[PDB]
Amino acid sequence: SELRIILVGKTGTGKSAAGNSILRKQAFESKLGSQTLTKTCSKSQGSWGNREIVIIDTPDMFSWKDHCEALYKEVQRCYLLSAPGPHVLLLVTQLGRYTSQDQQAAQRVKEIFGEDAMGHTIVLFTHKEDLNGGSLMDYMHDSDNKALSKLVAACGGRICAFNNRAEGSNQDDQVKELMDCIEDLLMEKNGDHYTNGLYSLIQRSKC
Template sequence: MDVPDTRRIVLLGKTGAGKSSLANTIFGEEVFALNHTLNSETKQCQAKTKAINGKKVTLIDNPGFFDPGRSEEDMKPELLKCFTECAPGPHAFLIVLKVEKFTEHEKAVVKQMCEHFSEDALTHATIVFTHGDQLPEEMKIEEYIRESDCLSDLVKKCGGRCHIVDNKYWKNNQQDEYRSNNFQVTMLLNTIEKIVTEKDGGYFTNEKLQAVESEIQKEEERIRRSSVNMPQEDIRHTAKSNVCKKQVEKASWTWKNGFVGLAVITGLLATVTAVLMKVLYYQKQK
């Protein structure tokens, strides 16, 4: 059952956009692990919960969609974990972009988001720009967006919602309120609350997320019967972990079967080809 005072927020963006740092900025402390390497920001889906302004906020930080060192099969367990962590559905998506040229990579992030969730997910989305120190002096992010037709179109699809932070330089800015993470995070959380209000307290969901939630609830009931004294929060956490593990195993087994099937077909084709070659050879000999 959904908890009214819980907000589930999914962070999406390409590798190096600053998703984990943004999550830490929102929480006001170093909760999410950072991996400062050349090719990677976050290798695994991370989900953390903290109370903010009387509400439980769960941030789900996902691996970059475009890590060149990871295959689609390697990413699949993380996507399944994302679905499990945000079931029955996220209240908001944060599409994280750097203050820099809007390239095909950024466009592809949005495309993949719509493929994994749906186009309707954009009605729950907010664009959050990082590296705010790159924003020209005296310029606000809305002005920056107007300089790019692609960005303007994306923000329009997201209901005009956009914010900017600087995880490194705007931590204790007292002179300029706009260039302050405290100010921007407050505005961001207000935007998320506005989305929830506009959706009558609802969240984004689809058949996949509903199916995952159904499995979680069945697992919760099983755990509840076997562990009578376990707190509900622990039951929920254990149920999600178990369901995620089962889904990953199922996906892995499906992929392996598909691979084996492909190998069998390939082997049969090779055998048939060899037989045909022999037949043609003997016909020529005659």
């Protein structure tokens, strides 16, 4: 049975890399800030355990401000690629580096996916290696970043961390932690995916 994940967040936080970590393959292209920004979603899939994992990597364009002709059609494409709705939105942020631009990117997520999207969101912190083997929960307990605390609260405290450069059993271990977070979220939601008005329209147009 399908597990559908949509990656969201500020550009450069490591979301394409996180997609690669989850799928254990080079599904999405990571890039430096100097490189061209993306305008189209990319979709890839793989297996974890007995389950098909399907991931949509949202374009950098979804974080842009002001008028953008391509946005509406590509948001429609994102919905069509994730229908009947994502099980999880993974809001990707770099550990210790949550800024006003992250806050704004999170607002774009609510605009695109709806006010209630945080109820199916997990906050994924990249650069886990910066913890030096320390507890993520303890780090977040002591974090003084007020905007980050508010986001994490809106996401029901659901958090996880990746070192996207991890390999081997270290990679397996961090992906397992994310799957454990997803298991608990889905349990709370009786296995349901996120939905909204627009996802409903799509679902009701198919036989």
